[PDB]
Automatic annotation (TrEMBL):
Alphabetic keyword roster: Metal-binding, Molybdenum, Signal
Organism the protein comes from: Azotobacter vinelandii
Presence of keyword Ribosomal protein: no
Protein's name in the database: Binding protein
GO molecular function (one): metal ion binding
Annotated residues for binding of molybdate: 36, 146
InterPro entries per UniProt: AvModA-like_subst-bd (IPR044084), ModA (IPR005950), ModA/WtpA (IPR050682)
Cited SUPFAM superfamilies: Periplasmic binding protein-like II
Length: 231
């Protein structure tokens, strides 16, 4: 009974992974999710999780340094891809020029202090010189996770949103609405690391799952969700 907590970007992908791991091994996983910052704080506050999938390297690195992570268990399990998305077809152009105009109301951006996909979206606005203007105009609506940014954008509560590719890519590889991938030099890469929680009471099972996460079937599921893997 492995208890796994994930940054919200990776929830849907982890559900797919957990389903496949259960089919192969008979082991069931209990998934929890939240923004990377708050999940880190819950772990430091003794939350009884076995494995943590962050949306960054910083939280796993801090847990390792502070003695909360099992030594040697930290690794990069996926590299995300930031997307500017709208549920409305035709609103987001393929060069992101929409961001500099007034043809939309709000943009959902997860809180950059706690959600790495929010940090990435904020970095894109800084790269374009639009963060100050959109902040002054009160057009940025702070979401508490990229799960919430995606929810707000998917319902149209926000005309635009900065989300994870995994949240919007479909089984056939299509993406509904409209979208723009900010180039890789517009934000720092979203390098996602995982750790085993040192206090786990299921060490062997946690290590088995962490090993499986690097294997061919897990990697194929991760890539199908639009993530990349270290070269």
């Amino acid at each position: 009974e492995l208890k796994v907590v994930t940054a919200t970007n990776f929830l849907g992908t982890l559900e797919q992974l957990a389903g496949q791991f259960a089919k192969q091994t008979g082991h069931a996983v209990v998934i929890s999710s939240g923004s990377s910052g708050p999940v880190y704080a819950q772990i430091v506050n003794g939350a009884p999780y076995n494995v943590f999938f962050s949306a960054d390297e910083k939280s796993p690195e801090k847990l390792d340094n502070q003695g909360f992570a099992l030594p040697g268990s930290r690794f990069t399990y996926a590299i995300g891809k930031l997307v500017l998305w709208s549920a409305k077809p035709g609103l987001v152009d393929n060069q992101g020029k929409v961001l500099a105009g007034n043809g939309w109301r709000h943009i959902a951006i997860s809180n950059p202090q706690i959600a790495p996909y929010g940090l990435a979206g904020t970095q894109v606005l800084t790269h374009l010189g639009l963060l100050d203007k959109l902040t002054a105009q009160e057009r940025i609506v702070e979401a508490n996770s990229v799960g919430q940014a995606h929810s707000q954008t998917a319902s149209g509560a926000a005309d635009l949103g900065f989300v994870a590719l995994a949240q919007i890519i479909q089984a056939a590889a299509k993406i509904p609405g409209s979208h723009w991938f900010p180039p890789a030099n517009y934000y720092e890469p979203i390098v996602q690391q995982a750790v085993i929680t040192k206090s786990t009471a299921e060490k062997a099972n946690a290590e088995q799952f962490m090993s499986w996460m690097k294997g061919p079937k897990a990697v194929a599921i991760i890539k199908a969700a639009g993530y990349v893997l270290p070269q």
